[PDB]
Amino acid sequence: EKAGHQTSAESWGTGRAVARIPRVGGGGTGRSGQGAFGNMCRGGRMFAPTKTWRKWNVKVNHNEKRYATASAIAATAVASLVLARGHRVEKIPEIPLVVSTDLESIQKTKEAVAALKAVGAHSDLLKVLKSKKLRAGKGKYRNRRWTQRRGPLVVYAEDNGIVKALRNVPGVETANVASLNLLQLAPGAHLGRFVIWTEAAFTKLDQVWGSETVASSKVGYTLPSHIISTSDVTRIINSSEIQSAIRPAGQATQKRTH
Amino acid sequence: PSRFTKTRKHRGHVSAGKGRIGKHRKHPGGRGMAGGQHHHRINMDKYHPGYFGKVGMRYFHKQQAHFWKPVLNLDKLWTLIPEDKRDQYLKSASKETAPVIDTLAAGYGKILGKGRIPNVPVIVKARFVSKLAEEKIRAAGGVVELIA
Amino acid sequence: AKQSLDVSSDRRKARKAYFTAPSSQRRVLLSAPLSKELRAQYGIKALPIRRDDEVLVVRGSKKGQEGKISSVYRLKFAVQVDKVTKEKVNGASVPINLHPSKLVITKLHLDKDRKALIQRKGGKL
Amino acid sequence: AISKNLPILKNHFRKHWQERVKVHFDQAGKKVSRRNARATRAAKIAPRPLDLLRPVVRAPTVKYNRKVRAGRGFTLAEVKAAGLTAAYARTIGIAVDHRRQNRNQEIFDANVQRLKEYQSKIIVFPRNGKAPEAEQVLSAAATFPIAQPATDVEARAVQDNGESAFRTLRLARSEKKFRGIREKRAREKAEAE
RNA sequence: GUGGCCUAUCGAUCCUUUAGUCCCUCGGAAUUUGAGGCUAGAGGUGCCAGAAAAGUUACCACAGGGAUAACUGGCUUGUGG
RNA sequence: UAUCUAGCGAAACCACAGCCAAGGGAACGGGCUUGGCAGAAUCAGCGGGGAAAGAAGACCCUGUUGAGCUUGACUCUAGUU
RNA sequence: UGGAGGUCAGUGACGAAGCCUAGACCGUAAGGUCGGGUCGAACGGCCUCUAGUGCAGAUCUUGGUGGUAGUAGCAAAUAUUCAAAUGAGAACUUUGAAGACUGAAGUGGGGAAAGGUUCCACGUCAACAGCAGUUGGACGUGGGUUAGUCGAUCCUAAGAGAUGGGGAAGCUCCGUUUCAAAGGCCUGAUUUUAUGCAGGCCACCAUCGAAAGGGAAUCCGGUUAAGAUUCCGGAACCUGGA
RNA sequence: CGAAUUUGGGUAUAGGGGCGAAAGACUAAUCGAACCAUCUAGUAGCUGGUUCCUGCCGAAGUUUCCCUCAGGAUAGCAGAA
RNA sequence: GGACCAAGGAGUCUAACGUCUAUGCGAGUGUUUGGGUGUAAAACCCAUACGCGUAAUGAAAGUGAACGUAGGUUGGGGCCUCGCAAGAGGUGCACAAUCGACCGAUCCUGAUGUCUUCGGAUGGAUUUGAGUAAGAGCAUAGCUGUUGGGACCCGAAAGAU
RNA sequence: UUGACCUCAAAUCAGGUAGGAGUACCCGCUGAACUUAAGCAUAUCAAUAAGCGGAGGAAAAGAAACCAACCGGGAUUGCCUUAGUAACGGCGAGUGAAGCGGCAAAAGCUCAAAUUUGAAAUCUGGUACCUUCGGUGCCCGAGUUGUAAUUUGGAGAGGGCAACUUUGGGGCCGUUCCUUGUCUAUGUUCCUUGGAACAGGACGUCAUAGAGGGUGAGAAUCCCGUGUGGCGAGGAGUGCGGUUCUUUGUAAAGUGCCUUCGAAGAGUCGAGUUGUUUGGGAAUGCAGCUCUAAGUGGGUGGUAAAUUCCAUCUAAAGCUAAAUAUUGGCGAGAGACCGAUAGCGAACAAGUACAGUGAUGGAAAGAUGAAAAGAACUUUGAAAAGAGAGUGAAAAAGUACGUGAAAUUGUUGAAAGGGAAGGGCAUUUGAUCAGACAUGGUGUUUUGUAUU
């Protein structure tokens, strides 16, 4: 707050053939007579100095947070969204990917990598490993020296060594079904994270989010309803119910007359 | 964010949207509510009539807890009954089995008669009631018992 | 990744600590790996390099050059090895400094303290 | 200064408000510190429940008259009825408040019952005993929750005689308003021979 | 017939002071004083939509103004010639 | 002294520049229009012009900008009674 | 344009960024892309986030550079000349000769304030001496200031200023003998115990304040590159002691 | 140009104060109120500046009130939704 | 104003808000004061309150929103019925005009009953309210606009300690 | 005359203690004006800056002379809220709390006023001894104008009836807190580029270690570390679970029932007035002066007064952790921050150089290379230096050193040049340059003898 203002500079006024900016008094220094106290001045204070009471954290409604988390969870089960998100799931038999609770019970990084190879997340692993590159700016000397992709997110129900086993393998994240961050479920606001569920995690999903037969276990919460019954508006349009009442169409490209 | 503001679009135009003739000066009409009786009197008398002067009598050390009295209307009276038993109470509309509603427990101080409770009798405990609400509840077949 | 709160992953702090390390800590910083034969014999991966240690260069333009340490220049963060020098235009031989990470130790100068250090690290002489 | 149709805003920022700005960046750090302090106190007093037993009292005013909450400490009358000295209760972990009285049989009875439940639920180690460790719980308030009284049953019978319950209120208000003038009138009629 | 034959002849907030209700409040309850509110007038702002207000500077200062005077120039030519 | 030579070597100032006549034009042009015209590179002088330079006119006016001084201005005050 | 989240498992020491290039292409444009040169370690496309985000001006700021311009100018204080030497080099240094000046309220010999090593010698000329320089108060390295008698030190002047005491919220103000119980100074006691005490006299107002005021006492000759009333030789004087 | 003389050193007076054989003179090139730091990034209806491109739309200098006349509010004119 | 060139250089952030818009939920809404938990300032979870909204009006004491299919009339998009194309009828949300009704305030009338001066039923009135009349709000974010702040940047003469 | 006592002195008497710094936060005193009010004086700024005095790791406040008006709460502090509200205000500009409610933290207390009166039972110091933050003797001293025990209003003190339930002080063992110390995996294998491999490719290994840094370029595996554990050293040890001398033997506290009592703070409450302050409004607090109390009295109950009652506490004496603050100090960890005209004034011998008599003012200034390998030697010059040579990946890195822009300049080359130059449209001339042609296709002359 005192940057640029630790001077006793005073304006010389008019009549001295110099601008009216405050100037440092004294002599024999090389700094005396120099401009001060201005954004345009070298060594002066910046325009509108940055304050710590700027708004840093921003509030979001709990329900909107849960809506985004549910959308990200649902996008994790869309095969095309995961590929578009770029997660090397071509070799995987089918997604969502569910693995037994023995994965929850795993202990070593070598066997965690072996499990990843067995289920097909290894390709995501090599993507993260070969994506390691230096940052492209002054973020290197701000403790952000390297960048790399995001690997699979292993979501469990109980921790019995899974977290530590997957801890060292690069790019793999591990999460509990209870938390299930949106920051991990849609990094960069891009839907379709590649998620490896455990069996217990997959079954706990229904209790933690609710269903049409069970309550959400989040009090006062229920999964959002859609504006539309289906996304196949093309199917609805080309259904007989609509086409029967629809009048015959033109040629889809009007012939140039005259 | 900063990139959506018109300051980003005024870059290159001399006056930054403030005019060449009348510039962006410091406080060219006063600071705050200055001149509200002299040169902002037109704005005052157009948009805030009643701004100047005092009317009522004072109240030194006024506590709002004295005047706490949230009002509950009759059309909203039946929402104070749990919805699990609300249907049963409405269908088994009889005396000697009337639901008891503690309006003070719900957090209201006065019952008002905005209209059309069903003909189900009900005992409603109220700190204060209005005349019309009392007649409506008596006609519906219940009673209002004053409480404190 | 690191876990404890007392270790700092700050590049600035790490570089400052390295470049202002006193000589006692520079001794550990200038540790060197033993050869395959020495590692098999002792059971030690790397040791702080000494003044009369025999080493071999395994990296740089002088790869595969053997020699006995002439000095351990901890201030310059290097070791000067006898028979690893440069001949100048005037014919004088100036020592060529190099980092102990780029040597392999082929024979240790053993003292009572060095032997005890080997036992501490878990060696068998 | 004053311009188009807008509310009159009273923003009190004419002093050096920028020197007195507290922005709570340490909210998370202070939460961690508070949890650490609670854990440290628990380990320091290990078997003890980290907080005293508070009484159930009534909220004072007419707005909050309905609620019943946790008080500072039990009345000397309450601790006597539970059957222990104020000093001993303070010793074995019961909050004792001297200045609070009880003009209320229900509140007195509820706090007596709270004291008896606490005495039944705690075990006090002897000064020179065998130290029977007892798997500490960390909250007397959680182990003895405040529960609101049941003022009435769900359903009853309608007892209607025809006071209208609003004429009653109007008459009570009128009686209170005109009491003093009525007393004065009676005084004059009695002092007039 | 709701003042002057018509078109002129007048005055906010705050404060005070009257008139009226015998009405509301003084917030732990009388009662009686006192005080504060409700509605309508009056005490005045003539700079008349309404600040409470003497000079001097030839010792002077600042922000400005060719929005504005003291030369020239320019239009006009009463007046002068 | 200026001047020429050897050495040494600044500054003011500078939108771009540097020939006029008339016109019109912010009513006194280096530029525009229409005419006169118009030949490298220069030296010493000179003081007509550059409305030359030097200073956000010190006169005048405006500002709800000051300050020094004065008084039966308004509002106070040390002292004194 | 700087930074941030994702992604291109993007470009790169087989050359990233940057810069230069009257070379090419694209866009109405802001601009983007590429050829060539230079360079040597990082950087970009896309989807989003973010802002200390775009300059021709502000007699803007800081730094740098011009024309003017090889120009104004380097003209007060009478004045220099000849020849040797040294030197790469001499109008300017050294020496010799001549001509002059200051002309004893000096351009001489010393000091006070101030400066601080400028003193002296040796070496040396990149910068500085508004020309030059071999010279210098410059640069480098060293040498040099010797007191009983000269000063300070002591005294008090105008004055400053503790104490006692009184103000003041207080930093501090007053006050300097004031409403103070304000000390040191002569001779015996004087080694059964000391410097005690029945020995005696008295009763100042702290202190600081002058390198020209007041004051104890040193002169001559010689001596150094540079100190001398200070060293040496000689010849004295004062103070305090026995 | 022998004195109301000139002058060294010491000492006293300090900023609404000093000092003045009096000029608002002098008080460190500063005086009709020194200098230093801070309040202070003091306020300015006043002057100056205000940084990329293209596309579409596109004015006002008028009404009323204002210690109002270099300024505001209001209505108008304009854009956008 | 600008001799020239490089770099720097001016509508920012915040508290409280207006309009509009997007989003979540919706007569409710807002987890983030705090607690729990954590791969630790993230993320995830959890209350009780409180804010705002769901009632207005009056200075206040206080009183407090259906004479009706939540009214009548006009106009209304859409829908329903109908003569093979014209053209009628029915129903008519939103919304806009108008006449009413209800709640508060003001001015009247004052009925049973009386603590005989309280009560205030009933009826009214060129009066009046930011009201009711099958709720819309609450949070978050964005541009623009407002005010306090150094407040787009630079600029006094001064004043105080 | 000899001894006290009281008050006042003196001592280089014995032992202590205060000052001064730093003051970010904290406790007070003093105290503006700029500013806003579009002027300005009340107001605002602001009970702020400057000035002065005083502490600590926090300070302060703190166990009601409280809030409240309720079915009452119950020391203090802080947060959310109350609330931009009640209220104040040229009722203008503006200002503006508190009760309740939810929470964090919670902790309580002690003197004065009492006769030990069958025993001043209290304490400092000197001198001894010892297990020395101290204990035990003895001895003068202090003190009866009152030092111990006993009681603090929640109470409690005596006097009677029963006759119950209850420990102390110090070493040792480990808790635990702190300062640390050491040990604890995995490639430098092969190939290309390069001065260097830390780059690319192949094959691997460890991973509870793929954070970060160094090393001749982007290094988990070369080094330090990192991760997970292990093993030590020293200080504090009465937050605490076990042994030790094991109990001063009438060595020590709480409870029920009846009686009599029940001391409770004075120039102080309070009142008036004056000044200041507050949202406090016929006066919120504070202070000056004047008056000046009482005993179920006294304070308060947010409108002045008289009379009538209710409610609530108990002032004029004192201590006390935690939640709270903290641009200073000392340790740490971090960032969508800045990147050498930026970020602190200061990345450097920076509060330095130097300016001012002084108070004070106050810069500029980072980068050879991986390694000086910092250029031997020859030659020309008086020398600086040049030309060669040499080192280096590079001298297009030579200390005036990374890159090396622009303004400005030299040379060379090309053009134009009759009192500016520059520009637009259009062509011309010179210079310079991009854009189909073997190519998916037509069918045969198969060249450098799946294909042309």
UniProtKB/Swiss-Prot annotation, chain A:
It comes from Saccharomyces cerevisiae (strain ATCC 204508 / S288c). There are 2 genes for uL4 in yeast. The modification Omega-N-methylarginine is found at residue 42. One of its GO terms (molecular function) is structural constituent of ribosome. It is found in: Cytoplasm; Nucleus. Keywords: Acetylation, Cytoplasm, Methylation, Nucleus, Ribonucleoprotein, Ribosomal protein, RNA-binding. Component of the large ribosomal subunit (LSU). Mature yeast ribosomes consist of a small (40S) and a large (60S) subunit. The 40S small subunit contains 1 molecule of ribosomal RNA (18S rRNA) and 33 different proteins (encoded by 57 genes). The large 60S subunit contains 3 rRNA molecules (25S, 5.8S and 5S rRNA) and 46 different proteins (encoded by 81 genes). uL4 is associated with the polypeptide exit tunnel. uL4 interacts with its chaperone ACL4 and the nuclear import receptor KAP104. The keyword Transcription regulation does not apply. The chain holds residues 54 to 311 of 362 of the full protein. This is Large ribosomal subunit protein uL4A. The lineage of its organism: Eukaryota, Fungi, Dikarya, Ascomycota, Saccharomycotina. N-terminally acetylated by acetyltransferase NatA. Coiled coil: none annotated.
Swiss-Prot record, chain B:
This is Large ribosomal subunit protein uL15. GO terms for molecular function: RNA binding; structural constituent of ribosome. Its main location: cytoplasm. It comes from Saccharomyces cerevisiae (strain ATCC 204508 / S288c). Component of the ribosome, a large ribonucleoprotein complex responsible for the synthesis of proteins in the cell. The small ribosomal subunit (SSU) binds messenger RNAs (mRNAs) and translates the encoded message by selecting cognate aminoacyl-transfer RNA (tRNA) molecules. The large subunit (LSU) contains the ribosomal catalytic site termed the peptidyl transferase center (PTC), which catalyzes the formation of peptide bonds, thereby polymerizing the amino acids delivered by tRNAs into a polypeptide chain. Changing residue 37 to E: Confers resistance to cycloheximide, an inhibitor of polypeptide elongation. There is a cross-link at residue 95 (Glycyl lysine isopeptide (Lys-Gly) (interchain with G-Cter in ubiquitin)). One of its GO terms (cellular component) is cytosol. Residues 1-13, 20-29 have a biased composition (Basic residues). A motif (Nuclear localization signal) lies at residues 6-12, 23-29. GO terms for biological process: cytoplasmic translation. Transmembrane segments: none annotated. Keywords: Cytoplasm, Isopeptide bond, Ribonucleoprotein, Ribosomal protein, Ubl conjugation.
From Swiss-Prot, chain C:
InterPro entries: KOW (IPR005824), Rib_uL2_dom2 (IPR014722), Ribosomal_uL24_CS (IPR005825), Ribosomal_uL24_euk/arc (IPR005756), Ribosomal_uL24_KOW (IPR041988), Translation_prot_SH3-like_sf (IPR008991). PANTHER family: 60S RIBOSOMAL PROTEIN L26 FAMILY MEMBER (PTHR11143). This is Large ribosomal subunit protein uL24A. Belongs to the universal ribosomal protein uL24 family. Keywords: Cytoplasm, Ribonucleoprotein, Ribosomal protein. One of its GO terms (biological process) is cytoplasmic translation. There are 2 genes for uL24 in yeast. One of its GO terms (cellular component) is cytosol. Its main location: cytoplasm. The keyword Ribonucleoprotein applies. Component of the large ribosomal subunit (LSU). Mature yeast ribosomes consist of a small (40S) and a large (60S) subunit. The 40S small subunit contains 1 molecule of ribosomal RNA (18S rRNA) and 33 different proteins (encoded by 57 genes). The large 60S subunit contains 3 rRNA molecules (25S, 5.8S and 5S rRNA) and 46 different proteins (encoded by 81 genes). GO terms for molecular function: RNA binding; structural constituent of ribosome. It comes from the Eukaryota. It is found in: Cytoplasm.
Swiss-Prot record, chain D:
Pfam families: Ribosomal_L13e. InterPro entries: Ribosomal_eL13, Ribosomal_eL13_CS. One of its GO terms (molecular function) is RNA binding. It comes from the Eukaryota. Its main location: cytoplasm. GO terms for biological process: cytoplasmic translation. The modification Phosphothreonine is found at residues 143, 151. It is found in: Cytoplasm. Keywords: Cytoplasm, Phosphoprotein, Ribonucleoprotein, Ribosomal protein. The keyword Ligase does not apply. GO terms for cellular component: cytosol; cytosolic large ribosomal subunit. Component of the ribosome, a large ribonucleoprotein complex responsible for the synthesis of proteins in the cell. The small ribosomal subunit (SSU) binds messenger RNAs (mRNAs) and translates the encoded message by selecting cognate aminoacyl-transfer RNA (tRNA) molecules. The large subunit (LSU) contains the ribosomal catalytic site termed the peptidyl transferase center (PTC), which catalyzes the formation of peptide bonds, thereby polymerizing the amino acids delivered by tRNAs into a polypeptide chain. Belongs to the eukaryotic ribosomal protein eL13 family. Present with 133000 molecules/cell in log phase SD medium. Component of the large ribosomal subunit (LSU). Mature yeast ribosomes consist of a small (40S) and a large (60S) subunit. The 40S small subunit contains 1 molecule of ribosomal RNA (18S rRNA) and 33 different proteins (encoded by 57 genes). The large 60S subunit contains 3 rRNA molecules (25S, 5.8S and 5S rRNA) and 46 different proteins (encoded by 81 genes). This is Large ribosomal subunit protein eL13A.
